[PDB]
UniProtKB/Swiss-Prot annotation:
Residues 17-30 have a biased composition (Basic residues). InterPro entries: L3_arc_euk, Ribosomal_L3_dom_3_arc_sf, Ribosomal_uL3, Ribosomal_uL3_CS, Transl_B-barrel_sf. Belongs to the universal ribosomal protein uL3 family. GO terms for biological process: translation. There is a cross-link at K293 (Glycyl lysine isopeptide (Lys-Gly) (interchain with G-Cter in SUMO1)). Keywords: Acetylation, Cytoplasm, Isopeptide bond, Methylation, Nucleus, Phosphoprotein, Ribonucleoprotein, Ribosomal protein, Ubl conjugation. This is Large ribosomal subunit protein uL3. The modification Tele-methylhistidine is found at H244. The modification N6-acetyllysine is found at K135, K285, K293, K365, K372. It comes from the Eukaryota. It comes from Oryctolagus cuniculus (Rabbit). Constitutively monomethylated at His-244 by METTL18. Methylation at His-244 regulates translation elongation by slowing ribosome traversal on tyrosine codons: slower elongation provides enough time for proper folding of synthesized proteins and prevents cellular aggregation of tyrosine-rich proteins. It is not required for incorporation of RPL3 into ribosomes.
Length: 394
RNA sequence: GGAGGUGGAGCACGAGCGCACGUGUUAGGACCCGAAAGAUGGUGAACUAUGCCUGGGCAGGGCGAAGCCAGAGGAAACUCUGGUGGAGGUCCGUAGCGGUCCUGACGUGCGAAUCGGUCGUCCGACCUGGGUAUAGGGGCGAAAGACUAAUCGAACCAUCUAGUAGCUGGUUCCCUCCAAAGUUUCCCUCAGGAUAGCUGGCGCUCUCCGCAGUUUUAUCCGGUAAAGCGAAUGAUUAGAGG
RNA sequence: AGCCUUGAAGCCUAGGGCGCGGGCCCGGGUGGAGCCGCCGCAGGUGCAGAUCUUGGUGGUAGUAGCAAAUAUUCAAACGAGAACUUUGAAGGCCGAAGUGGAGAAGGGUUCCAUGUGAACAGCAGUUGAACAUGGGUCAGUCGGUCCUGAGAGAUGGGCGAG
RNA sequence: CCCAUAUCCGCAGCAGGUCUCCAAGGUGAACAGCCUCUGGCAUGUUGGAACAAUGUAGGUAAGGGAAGUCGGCAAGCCGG
RNA sequence: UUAAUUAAAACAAAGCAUCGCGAAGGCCCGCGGCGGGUGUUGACGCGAUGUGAUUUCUGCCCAGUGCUCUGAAUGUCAAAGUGAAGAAAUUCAAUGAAGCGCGGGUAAACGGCGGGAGUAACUAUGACUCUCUUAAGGUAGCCAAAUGCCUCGUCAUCUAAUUAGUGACGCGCAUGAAUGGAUGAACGAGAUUCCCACUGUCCCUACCUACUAUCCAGCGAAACCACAGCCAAGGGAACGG
RNA sequence: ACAGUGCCAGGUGGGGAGUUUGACUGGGGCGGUACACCUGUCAAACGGUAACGCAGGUGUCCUAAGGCGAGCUCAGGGAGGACAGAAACCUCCCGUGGAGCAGAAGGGCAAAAGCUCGCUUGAUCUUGAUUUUCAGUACGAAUACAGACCGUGAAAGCGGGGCCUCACGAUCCUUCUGACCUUUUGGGUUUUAAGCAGGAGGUGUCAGAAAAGUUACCACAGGGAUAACUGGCUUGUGGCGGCCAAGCGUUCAUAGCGACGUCGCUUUUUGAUCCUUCGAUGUCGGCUCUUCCUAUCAUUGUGAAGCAGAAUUCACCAAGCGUUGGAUUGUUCACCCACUAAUAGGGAACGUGAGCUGGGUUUAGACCGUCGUGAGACAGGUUAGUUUUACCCUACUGAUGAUGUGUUGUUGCCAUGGUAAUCCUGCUCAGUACGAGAGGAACCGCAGGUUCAGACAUUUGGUGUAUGUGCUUGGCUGAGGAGCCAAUGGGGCGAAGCUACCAUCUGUGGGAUUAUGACUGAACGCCUCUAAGUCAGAAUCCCGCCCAGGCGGAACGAUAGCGCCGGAGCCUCGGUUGGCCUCGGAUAGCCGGUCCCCCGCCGGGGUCCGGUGCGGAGAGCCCUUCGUCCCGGGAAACGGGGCGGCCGGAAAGGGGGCCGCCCUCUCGCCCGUCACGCACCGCACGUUCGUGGGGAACCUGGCGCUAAACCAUUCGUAGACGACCUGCUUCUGGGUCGGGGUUUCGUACGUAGCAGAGCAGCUGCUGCGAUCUAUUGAAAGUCAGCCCUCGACACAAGGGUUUGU
């Protein structure tokens, strides 16, 4: 018989199966559709979730209750040291879909990238690309590369660059770089290859990919949470306290007929560590990394037009469980998937951004840099010392 | 003794007895296993029920009965106030005894009734050891058909006894031939029998005229289909002429 | 005038065959002492079942489980072997209505010494209330013994087939 | 000799049952509970490593305060 | 108090009221007797019942069924005895124990305790009247009560809203007087309603601890099993592995 | 002389014993009797034929209503006759039975079978046969006779009951009647008793026991032959929907409704039935959770109104998304309160008890009412009443993994499967359109929210055994200090982590189209959204975005006794027995040339000419194999065979053609001349693709390569275990300790104090004293999963198992 009172089902069947992701680094499932009339540009990037904070800005929203007024907004800090292009991969459109046509690699590949090619770097002899790299040094090999580059011009329709991160500049334990294809959108196929060929072994800073006030998508793997029951995995109603044999369950997992449990019924199992794509996360700031100019370390990348204090984005005591952000970073509005240190794929939007929220221009008045390791109450150590005064340590 | 009818499991020139084999029906344990029951004679009150005999046991508190002392009041009766006193099938509560709820634990348990918290009572119609008495259509019951050795709306043990079962289950090698019925009547008959029918087997009396789930030719029988209702019975519409 | 220690019955056999079949024959192996053909006689004479009887074995399955009562750690000794035995030292618990010291009923040698580590003690054990070989309970005065208790129970007598 | 979370009865070294005697300090009304001395024991028929779900047993919870449920069941408040 | 699903409103109880009995007796046991229990007793006792403290009250009915009392006045009435017929067996008559019939008593014995119509100067009711009628025709009380079908009765109160609760009403299917009626302090691990307080019961879930589960070494069962084990429809012993 | 006892006799005697307490039956019970009979019908023209089928009857009645004879004629009607009339009695006429014959009905009957008289007892005695039911038994009833006695009639005759079809009863026992009856046991007489034959006493459950209840304290043997669920057939009832059109709607049938009638659909109602299940399918409701239907309440896109606007009603495509919080009740159902866009209706074994709960129903205790003598009963109330098992298979959820790609790794494609966003409010439009007024919109834009989904912890909150740091109770270590125990002693605050619409962030684009509105346009000289053709078109659908990623591919790196190129054989697996190396397409039209003309980066259009049952044909084309020899003739000579280079190929990429070479042949093809070869004596598996695929090996030359994976260790971005993410010598690495930062609590011990309420002792001093001030934002902790050090210390160049085209 029909269920007495209507109610929406718990959870979305569009995110099934609720299993551990097969990839740790978020995969770009769909790159932006190429527009041949735009200049050659890259469409994605890799960053690492440093941590969260909040900022003060004045909203510019005509007809809104917060028009001309200051608001406090949470933001996620993603460290984005420049990537290094090391290879090109070309694709051919076939009636069975894009097929990898040809891959070319640069002559020199840093050991961070090579670590990606091994399961035990300690035990290996580091022989990767030791014989390929010779193709760039002899006339017979060189004449074979430009033919490979010429073939990719005749036949390939999609061009991507194999860029990798620079793990030596991060505060992390890992030394193995994250390597990913990035589609080269823009001009003709020939213009894509000349642009990509010129940038082999070169560095591509995040600013060259993304801009201020741009809406982007973050792709990553959520925080794993292990085996979970239906109450926590699916958010079903807890049964009454009197229930015998447990109340953190779904009471009826199906009807007599069909004589099977259906795929649409909440069950226990893995929670978290799911691949997810989130869209429309606005870029609030592309902060510049530390520079040594005239013997001085310039690090006031957390200063604003309305706050001239020389402080970095790092909070007192550093980003908890992450470290210190000393490279370029992207300040995203809101929260993103993953743990601290999680590698996050930054991708340009697949949509046309014509909305007041999407077009709004961000102007920061303040960036909170108090300690997150507790209830921090000082923005800077200079401010803390001036308030507290001398201590017994002094 | 005769004549003529009628009842008999008769005579009318024997066919029986003895033995053996088969089949069928029965009486017996009765093809095998299966009741709930009933009867006789015995063993149990080490559990529990109840009476009796002789022993043991039950913190700390609350309330504050009668009696008594003092002070005040009063003409008397007596009254008021403060103490003392320590009653009670009295109250909170431990040991003990019990077992309300969680409808908790457990539910192939630690346990064939237990465990946790929470609970009832806790000087009495109180709790308990041992001795002793009541024994099965009997006991004992502050009464629930309770208890009477994990057994109780009649214990347990052996025998009668292989109790009876129109009811359930089973019923053991091969080939060959033939091959049903669920219908009639009677039955406290309706899940069963007896009875006729349907089957099989053994033959025997003949044969190389008789018979037939058939037609033909003759000849009867019938009251359904249809038809009729300006024909009987019954029902029924409309005008018309007297 | 059957077969048989020059190998009976039984049992096994990707051996050769026979018969529509019930079955049977022969070859090979194992076995070690009896057995079969034909004419008759006799029967406690043929199994797939009966929640059949008795015995054996599976999958489940190296699975459920070995979770009630706060708790162990260090060093050494013996030893083939040590989370579990002994000693020493720590840290804990029962907390005088005890996890202390003694009895009644019941048990019946479980008591004590030495030995074993087969089986048992639902892991292990160098240990045990297990197994083995030997010991151990001393009374005028502590109980029984005697008294009578509720009660049981002869004789006389009565009843009674007994 | 045991006299009982192992010498007895429950098939067993069974969280059950089974009659008694003696009875320290502190707190406290107290043979209550909590800690300790005398005496006793080795966590109750095993250990190691983890710290998922679901349990069993304990706790805490903003704002509301029975709207839950057959029912305030459960817990909670009160407490000398 | 139902050991082991019911702890209760059930049982008991003091109180109350009946009933039998003066011992060669009442009540009871026993196969049996100069047998036995009450009874080491004696009506302020023993035996058999009902109700269930106190308070207040306990109405009418003896026709029915019981129980009980009186009996030669006296219908029926066994054996035995008496008389007559007959050869006797036998038959017939007369007589007439208890018990039944007959007549009283008795309900704190089992139990029971009506129907129809008309009627007051608006309407409604109908104190009043008529009538049929039984052994009485339900009195004092009480009630949609643990008792009322219709029924979630009607009115009021309690809520925003109440098949719940409480107070009223009462032609009450089918209330009612020791088959006890009405009450009422204290008491209840008894049933029910509301309120304050409290709170994770809930909105709406989260986190933490211990023991498991978990993995490992050792050790290690049991239930159950035709063969088994992916579905849709079909047909089919009318829902197929 | 009674109590008393022994033995008989009568009464009483559920205290106790034994036993019974029918059958049929759309379950049983209650109700009926279809249980023994009879008539009509069913019944299908012999007979027979069932149902709790239909319409009825029977357990009697008759001294005549039996028997005979005779004589008459009935119901009804018409017409006449004093009282007399509708109806009394008399008369005449008609009268086929329309009357009567005991009764139910059917049949039969007119000088009779009816009515009336006269005489009577054939309703008597007796043996057989027969018919009906049937078994060819009994009874009952009936039919023909036969033998006696009779009645009646003049007689023929008729009659042994009723005009025919019903009206009834075994054995045993009792009673009566009959005989010059038999027996009555050793004989005789006599009473008695028993026999034989015929009646009666009765069994209606009628082929014939002698028979009351209750069980909820219940029991056994069974039954799915049989009820209480689901399911199945059916669909009366319930629900929903059409058709006709009398009316309603002021007018007007059909905007919206719709009588009298009628046709359907559904199985979310109840029935009917009894097919499955009684060696058990857990029986109401709620809770929880998913899914599906549409008969659509809301929302999107629409059509019609008795649509001015607003509001509403009818209808279409339509199930994408929603459809709520509560008081009373066990409730389903209902009723109300409140909010809402709306508060639609249903299925899934009346979804869902090894998912729960157990309020109700439905055991055992107990109360009330009614009923019963009672035990007891009650779709009447009330209260208390044990909810068992998963470790098996599958399904499902997650986790390792498996084939096979030579091994291994990085980066990737996507076949397939899933899939998602949703509704409302405010502002503006606008007090505008519309409207007399009242009232009163909409599209575009802007700002928010609801429901849902996916995350996340900067902030606020929650937790907190960091057992971090204070406070604090009882006890314990002689005290101080420092601590511990009280199953987390209690409590304040609290890091990290986890976590809350209880904080924060984010949630998207196309295509074909449905309904509908249209274009052009015939059919059908007009018209027409339709017939051919064409356009716009949506919470629908499909795709995208997003989640997974195949016994599915790809590119690229590195490849340890192994890779590449260049002899005999041996095993094993099979199949096969020439090749076609390509326009695009139309089919009411095609193909090939022609370029002479027009365009274009040699190709397109035109013209012109040829073919078209395609012959520049798949009905086709190419290749064709017996070999060699001698010498001729045609054909080649621009020729055949054999090492270096350049154009060219990517959807799954060419051992094609062409330029050189140094060579090598004038033989290859056709027709002839000339002979030869194992000619194996008629015969199968012959004849290739075939140096086929795969596997071991054995060689024998050249050119080349010297890896990873897994374990172990470590990490914590991960986690039940596996798995997953990481590190393991660049004078560099991680580790440990130390230091610094951050952060929590809140100011340490000691020491000093002329601070301290007081008290004690000594003559102002010294003691005891909770607490107070300074030292002292002090002390203590702080990554175990916080940040930075490069200070100290050691360690680190390792170990095991595998893998080859
Ligand atoms: Mg619904
Ligand atoms: Mg429960
Ligand atoms: Mg923080
Ligand atoms: Mg016979
Ligand atoms: Mg026999
Ligand atoms: Mg009997
Ligand atoms: Mg005793
Ligand atoms: Mg008391
Ligand atoms: Mg008390
Ligand atoms: Mg329980
Ligand atoms: Mg369990
Ligand atoms: Mg007593
Ligand atoms: Mg007795
Ligand atoms: Mg009873
Ligand atoms: Mg037998
Ligand atoms: Mg037997
Ligand atoms: Mg039978
Ligand atoms: Mg009979
Ligand atoms: Mg049968
Ligand atoms: Mg006929
Ligand atoms: Mg006809
Ligand atoms: Mg074999
Ligand atoms: Mg021998
Ligand atoms: Mg024998
Ligand atoms: Mg067998
Ligand atoms: Mg295990
Ligand atoms: Mg244990
Ligand atoms: Mg002791
Ligand atoms: Mg001792
Ligand atoms: Mg062991
Ligand atoms: Mg010993
Ligand atoms: Mg004696
Ligand atoms: Mg423990
Ligand atoms: Mg231990
Ligand atoms: Mg033990
Ligand atoms: Mg709260
Ligand atoms: Mg609060
Ligand atoms: Mg409520
Ligand atoms: Mg509710
Ligand atoms: Mg409570
Ligand atoms: Mg009980
Ligand atoms: Mg109980
Ligand atoms: Mg009485
Ligand atoms: Mg009275
Ligand atoms: Mg009377
Ligand atoms: Mg009455
Ligand atoms: Mg009254
Ligand atoms: Mg009252
Ligand atoms: Mg009331
Ligand atoms: Mg309420
Ligand atoms: Mg009464
Ligand atoms: Mg193990
Ligand atoms: Mg099956
Ligand atoms: Mg009696
Ligand atoms: Mg009886
Ligand atoms: Mg019957
Ligand atoms: Mg016929
Ligand atoms: Mg005549
Ligand atoms: Mg005659
Ligand atoms: Mg006659
Ligand atoms: Mg004589
Ligand atoms: Mg009962
Ligand atoms: Mg019943
Ligand atoms: Mg059936
Ligand atoms: Mg049904
Ligand atoms: Mg009209
Ligand atoms: Mg049938
Ligand atoms: Mg079954
Ligand atoms: Mg089931
Ligand atoms: Mg079952
Ligand atoms: Mg529709
Ligand atoms: Mg159901
Ligand atoms: Mg189920
Ligand atoms: Mg259940
Ligand atoms: Mg209940
Ligand atoms: Mg009951
Ligand atoms: Mg009565
Ligand atoms: Mg206007
Ligand atoms: Mg927080
Ligand atoms: Mg926190
Ligand atoms: Mg101290
Ligand atoms: Mg303790
Ligand atoms: Mg706190
Ligand atoms: Mg906090
Ligand atoms: Mg159209
Ligand atoms: Mg279109
Ligand atoms: Mg469109
Ligand atoms: Mg071949």
């Amino acid at each position: 018989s029909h269920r007495k009172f209507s109610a929406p089902r718990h959870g979305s069947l569009g995110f099934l199966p609720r299993k551990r992701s097969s990839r740790h680094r978020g995969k770009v499932k769909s790159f932006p559709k190429d527009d041949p009339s735009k200049p050659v540009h890259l469409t994605a990037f890799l960053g690492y979730k440093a941590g969260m904070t909040h900022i003060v800005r004045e909203v510019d929203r005509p007809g809104s209750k917060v028009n001309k007024k200051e608001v406090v907004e949470a933001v996620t800090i993603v460290e984005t040291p420049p990537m290094v292009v090391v290879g090109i991969v070309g694709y051919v459109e076939t009636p069975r879909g894009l097929r990898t046509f040809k891959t070319v690699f640069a002559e020199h590949i840093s050991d961070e990238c090579k670590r990606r090619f091994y399961k035990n770097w300690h035990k290996s002899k580091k022989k990767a690309f030791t014989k390929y790299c010779k193709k760039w040094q002899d006339d017979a090999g060189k004449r074979q590369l430009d033919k490979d580059f010429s073939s990719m011009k005749k036949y390939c329709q999609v061009i991507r660059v194999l860029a990798h991160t620079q793990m030596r500049l991060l505060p992390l334990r890992q030394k193995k770089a994250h390597l990913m294809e990035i589609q080269v959108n823009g001009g003709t196929v020939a213009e894509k290859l000349d642009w990509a060929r010129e940038r082999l072994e070169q560095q591509v800073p995040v600013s060259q990919v993304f801009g201020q006030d741009e809406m982007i998508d973050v792709i990553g793997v959520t925080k794993g949470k292990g085996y979970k029951g239906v109450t926590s995995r699916w958010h079903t109603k807890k049964l009454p306290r009197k229930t015998h044999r447990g109340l953190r369950k779904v009471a009826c997992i199906g009807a007599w007929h069909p004589a099977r449990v259906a795929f649409s019924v909440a069950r226990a199992g893995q929670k978290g560590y799911h691949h997810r794509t989130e869209i429309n996360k606005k870029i609030y700031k592309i902060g510049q990394g530390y520079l040594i100019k005239d013997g001085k370390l310039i690090k006031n990348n957390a200063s604003t037009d309305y706050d001239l204090s020389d402080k970095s984005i790092n909070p007192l005591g550093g980003f908890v469980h992450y470290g210190e952000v000393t490279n370029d970073f992207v300040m995203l509005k809101g929260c993103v998937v993953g743990t601290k240190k999680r590698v996050l794929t930054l991708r340009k939007s697949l949509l046309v951004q014509t909305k007041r929220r999407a077009l709004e221009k961000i102007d920061l008045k303040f960036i909170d840099t108090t300690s997150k390791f507790g209830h921090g109450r000082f923005q800077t150590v200079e401010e803390k010392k001036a308030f507290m005064g001398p201590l017994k340590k002094d």
